[PDB]
């Protein structure tokens, strides 16, 4: 039932706080933690994210100024004081500072807050972590956190919302190093990872929404809407009785292939057929990969609002039959639909898409080409080795991420025969 939420670094705390803000309005919780809804459905699965109402959230950072950013926000006063774990100085975009030095000293004090929130759960389902892979704390300390949580709670589900770097949003040349060193950690220690790519979020804001200079607020509006969409079935009763573990078992055919490509419709800053085709469109994906360049292993589509269940059924069959070639034929009925009656804020009809496609390799090949470009000239490698880190961890990491790409292409060209 219960999920413990961990938010790490500046990106992690920003997207983290916008998540709590979005879902609190859906569940009718005001900033003081008091319920004010008009439906019993809002309070039925409140135990999942809230403690009796207070978010079951842990707030970590090495930079103490993000505490003040968090408290400043609309729902900043809702989080528990004891749950804030902060350092004296940030990681300066150094994954090694986050993973091996400053972060590793503070990491034990975080596990004591986790252990406190976890020991208070009726039956803990798992962990939800928000972070970026480009920085130092969220990527370096966060992956360390993941590692220590997995050794303490090996039977629990570990899920991440991981934001991938793009030069379009942060032109910091060390971020591909930080993302590659983290993707290596995520392949071994997460059950499910939602790959939110800042390149995709920038291309949607810039080209589709036409925002000339998008801010983190414009990017985070899509991350928050995606986060609400994918967690819908965990938070509301409907025709589906499921948790993070059932999602994992049916979404992950092979252990390492647990990187999901989420999408949302409609895109903001409508009929059922128009919503269905948009969900399988590259312009609605939160990862910059063309889904028509690969094949889907598994797909989950959560629809939200009042609509004809029959129209949702036939339109979803109409896609598969028309586009037989994009779905692997060796996983029978690999497209699952869930229709939830409660729509999101300011809309009467929404669709959320969760794909496990072989086209995700495009996102990884982008990060690898950048890593490689920098790693060949040995650029800034001293910043990392100076924090007590081996040079061969850079080669472990690249090698592992390159293996992942090979697996995806293996299963993309595999026939049923």
């Amino acid at each position: 039932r219960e999920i413990v939420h961990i938010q790490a670094g500046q990106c992690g705390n920003q997207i983290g706080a916008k998540f709590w803000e979005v879902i609190s309005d859906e569940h009718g919780i005001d900033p003081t933690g008091s319920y004010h809804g008009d439906s019993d459905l809002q309070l039925e699965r409140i135990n999942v994210y809230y403690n009796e109402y207070v978010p079951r959230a842990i707030l970590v950072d090495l930079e103490p100024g993000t505490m003040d950013s968090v408290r400043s926000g609309p729902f900043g006063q809702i989080f528990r004081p004891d749950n804030f774990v902060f350092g004296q100085s940030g990681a300066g975009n150094n994954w090694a500072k986050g993973h091996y030095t400053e972060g590793a000293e503070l990491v034990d004090s975080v596990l004591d807050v986790v252990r406190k929130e976890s020991e208070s759960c009726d039956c803990l389902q798992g962990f939800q972590l928000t972070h970026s892979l480009g920085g130092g704390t969220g990527s370096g300390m966060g992956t360390l956190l993941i590692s220590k949580i997995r050794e303490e709670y090996p039977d629990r589900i570990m899920n991440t919302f991981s934001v991938m770097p793009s030069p379009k949003v942060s032109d910091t040349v060390v971020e591909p190093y930080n993302a590659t060193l983290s993707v290596h950690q995520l392949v071994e220690n997460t059950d499910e990872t939602y790959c939110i790519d800042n390149e995709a979020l920038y291309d949607i804001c810039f080209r589709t929404l036409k925002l000339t200079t998008p801010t983190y607020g414009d990017l985070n509006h899509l991350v928050s809407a995606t986060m609400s969409g994918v967690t819908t079935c965990l938070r509301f009763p409907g025709q589906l009785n499921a948790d993070l573990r059932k999602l994992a078992v049916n979404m992950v055919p092979f252990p390492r292939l647990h990187f999901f490509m989420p999408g949302f419709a409609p895109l903001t800053s409508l009929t059922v057929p128009e919503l269905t085709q948009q969900m399988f469109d590259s312009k609605n994906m939160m990862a910059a990969c063309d889904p028509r360049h690969g094949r889907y292993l598994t797909v989950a589509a959560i629809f939200r609002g009042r609509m004809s269940m029959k129209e949702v059924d036939e339109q979803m069959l109409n896609v598969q039959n028309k586009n037989s070639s994009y779905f692997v034929e060796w996983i029978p009925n690999n497209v699952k639909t869930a229709v939830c009656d409660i729509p999101p804020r300011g809309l009467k009809m929404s669709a959320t898409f969760i794909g496990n496609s072989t086209a995700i390799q495009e996102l990884f090949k982008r990060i690898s080409e950048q890593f490689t470009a920098m790693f060949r000239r040995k650029a800034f490698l001293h910043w990392y080795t100076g924090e007590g880190m081996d040079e061969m961890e850079f080669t472990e990491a690249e090698s592992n991420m390159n293996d992942l790409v090979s697996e995806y292409q293996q299963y993309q060209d595999a026939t049923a025969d």
Binding site: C123, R245, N250, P332, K336
Partner: protein, 422 residues
């Protein structure tokens, strides 16, 4: 006076069990608080000093959401708390988890609760076990329970009501794996199993009841009508199938191929009319559109056939309709008969449900080779995924070995050949 114990396992089993026990109450005139203002119905209901009629049933699930509905529904007062058993975490659609890890933490508690119901029985005949083939609990925990019940109650019979998976009715990708694994491991612990195909029940609700998109209540209300006709012989005075043992005798000539097909007619919308003759409702049983399992019996042979009539049915009218039917082929060395049974009690429907109350109905129970079509479909889905070893790590990660997937599939290959030899 021979008692029957019903075990309802997982979501599907509990939800169909709720539909059943509500319908038995309407048939026997028992109130939602267990009081009855008026032997036969005592096979299914024990009595308390206070005059309460308590179902002889156990509801089990590894997570409580479903059973909590029962603890606050119309029949909250019908079951004592101890008959409703729940864990805090489910098998997550994984047979291994329901059988080897999570299921082992609660099997003992469940056996104590069954032993409490059994010590209240003067002549326990056996158990009726309801479950999905697809769920982690429905598949894994049930197979664990069937193994243990063979040891602790070795001379008693076990009948099953199993829900076969259908893509139209919210199935999980791994349901073909769970289905094959539970079948393999239960094949020697069950005496007779009535499969219910969710695709069949779903097409009947659409075709015959005009429902645009059925939900589990619609499907379950129809299912419970079929289950009640099968169990009517055990809860009323009767000539045919009066004890669990007679089901094997009448329907199962060969022990491994113990999956009879059930057909029910007439299925009429409460909206829709005149009344159907005994001849017409009998003919409907041979129409493939009325079967609990999607298969063509005209592309197969019969090993056994039972017709169970309910309501205003004169025996001479049946003999005429059966005579017409002979003028459909049988297995080589088996007899070419029909066993008929008549209960003159009118068929009951849930007040304000989707089914129309009719004057006469029939349930035909047949054991036909055409049911192998259902196994062929499941095995094919298993083969496509297993060739690539898709999803297998979830199973081996929960105490299972890969060799078990192979034994199970071999057992199904051998069951497909058993149907082809017969």
């Amino acid at each position: 006076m021979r008692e029957c114990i019903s075990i309802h396992v997982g979501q599907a089993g509990v939800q169909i069990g709720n539909a059943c026990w509500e319908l038995y109450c309407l048939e026997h005139g028992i109130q939602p608080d267990g009081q009855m203002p008026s032997d036969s119905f005592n096979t299914f209901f024990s009595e308390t000093g206070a005059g309460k009629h308590v179902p002889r049933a156990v509801f089990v699930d590894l997570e409580p959401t479903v059973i909590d509905e029962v603890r606050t529904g119309t029949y909250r007062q019908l079951f004592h708390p101890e008959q409703l058993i729940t864990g805090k975490e489910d098998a997550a659609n994984n047979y291994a988890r329901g059988h080897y890890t999570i299921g082992k933490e609660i099997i003992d508690l469940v056996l104590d609760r069954i032993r409490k119901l059994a010590d209240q029985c003067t002549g326990l005949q056996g158990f009726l076990v309801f479950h999905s083939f697809g769920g982690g609990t429905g598949s894994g925990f049930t197979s664990l329970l069937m193994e243990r019940l063979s040891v602790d109650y070795g001379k008693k019979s076990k009948l099953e009501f199993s829900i076969y998976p259908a893509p139209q009715v919210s199935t999980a990708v791994v349901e073909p794996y769970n289905s094959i694994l539970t079948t393999h491991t239960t094949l020697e612990h069950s005496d007779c199993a009535f499969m219910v195909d969710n695709e069949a029940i779903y097409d009947i609700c659409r075709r015959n009841l005009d429902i645009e998109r059925p939900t589990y209540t619609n499907l379950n209300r129809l299912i419970s009508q079929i289950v009640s006709s099968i169990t009517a012989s055990l809860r009323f005075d009767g000539a045919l199938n009066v004890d669990l043992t007679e089901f094997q005798t009448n329907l199962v000539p060969y022990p491994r191929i113990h999956f009879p097909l059930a057909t029910y007619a007439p299925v009429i919308s409460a909206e829709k009319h005149e009344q159907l003759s005994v001849a017409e409702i009998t003919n409907a049983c041979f129409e493939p559109a009325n079967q609990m399992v999607k298969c063509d019996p005209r592309h197969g042979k019969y090993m056994a056939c039972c017709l169970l009539y309910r309501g205003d049915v004169v025996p001479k009218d049946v003999n005429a309709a059966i005579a017409t039917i002979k003028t459909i082929q049988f297995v080589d060395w088996c007899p070419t008969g029909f066993k008929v049974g008549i209960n003159y009690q009118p068929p009951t429907v849930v007040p304000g449900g989707d089914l129309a109350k009719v004057q006469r109905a029939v349930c035909m129970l047949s054991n036909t080779t055409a049911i192998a079509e259902a196994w062929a479909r499941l095995d094919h889905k298993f083969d496509l995924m297993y060739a690539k070893r898709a999803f297998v790590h979830w199973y081996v990660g929960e105490g299972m070995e890969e060799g078990e997937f192979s034994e199970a599939r071999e057992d199904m290959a051998a069951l497909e050949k058993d149907y082809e030899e017969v």
